[PDB]
Design a protein around this ligand. Structure first.
Ligand code: JO3
Ligand code: ZN
Lengths: 262, 8
């Protein structure tokens, strides 16, 4: 029941909001996973790996160029905003709001969220393979060689770009090859971040799960910790729960959430 | 370090 949720809402001083792919989906962002989530031949499992990058970096960067570019036309949905404005509203009252997101499209930032933790990184950050420097980057195209590349249709010609023309680290001391600062399959989450999040979750007195369920990664690393403290937890997603039954507001975040946070 | 989606 919504009323009941809202009563907790008003009381809460430290809200933590975990956000999954559902919320990026509603802004039309592709995730390249499950049926018909394709980019040329591949799904993300195929390309989002250290091995793919080591093996064919041009191809991977093509993939990522595309993703960077299709972002120019996808905007934050109402859920992104309702969150951001919440954070703003409550911050003024000295109540905190933090965002822990597995999404890498920077939509929450563009919505005006501030206290955000991007635990899979971000398409608009690079990491130098040589020196390890992490830098913001929204340039379009990220490098000339990549101009108008990364077409999605299966039959596109590979651009087969020489490594030295792919994006390179601007400290010429170094000039290492840049990769997208994103967590790939088979890599580990930055532990500095996980510690911060642990801390935030420990501190929190109401927890929201949006566009994913507590039952799955990554919500499942934590929701158990917070729940075992007795803190209430609300899911918002397109999922269903069994006739015989934490709160759950089935439906699009875009619709479910803004009323919930007013 | 925690594996993205636990390595499933
Ligand atoms: C994890 O799902 C994010 C990463 C694998 C990507 O390349 O999108
Ligand atoms: Zn470098």
């Amino acid at each position: 029941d919504l009323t009941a949720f809202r009563e907790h809402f008003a009381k809460a001083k430290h809200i933590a909001i975990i956000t999954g792919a559902g919320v990026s989906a509603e802004s039309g962002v592709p995730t390249f996973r499950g049926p018909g989530g394709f980019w040329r031949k591949w799904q993300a499992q195929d390309l989002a790996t250290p091995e793919a990058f080591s093996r064919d970096p041009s191809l991977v960067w093509e993939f990522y160029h595309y993703r960077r570019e299709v972002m120019r036309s996808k905007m934050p949905n109402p859920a992104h905003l309702a969150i951001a404005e919440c954070e703003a509203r409550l911050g003024q009252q000295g109540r905190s709001v933090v965002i822990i997101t597995q999404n890498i499209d920077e939509l929450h930032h563009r919505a005006g969220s501030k206290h955000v933790y991007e635990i899979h990184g971000s398409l608009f950050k690079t990491r130098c393979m040589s020196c390890g420097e992490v830098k913001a980057n929204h340039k379009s195209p990220i490098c000339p060689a990549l101009d108008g590349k990364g077409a999605p249709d299966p039959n596109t010609k590979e651009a087969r770009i020489p490594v030295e023309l792919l994006p390179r680290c601007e400290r010429k001391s170094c000039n290492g090859l840049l990769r997208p600062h994103v967590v790939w399959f088979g890599e580990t989450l930055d532990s500095d971040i996980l510690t911060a999040v642990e801390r935030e979750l420990e501190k929190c007195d109401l927890c929201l799960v949006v566009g994913t369920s507590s039952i799955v990664y990554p919500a499942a690393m934590f929701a158990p910790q917070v729940a075992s403290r007795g803190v209430p937890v609300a899911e918002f997603n397109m999922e269903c729960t069994p006739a015989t039954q934490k709160y759950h507001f089935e439906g699009p975040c875009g619709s479910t959430l803004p009323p919930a946070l007013e | 370090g925690v594996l993205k989606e636990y390595g499933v």
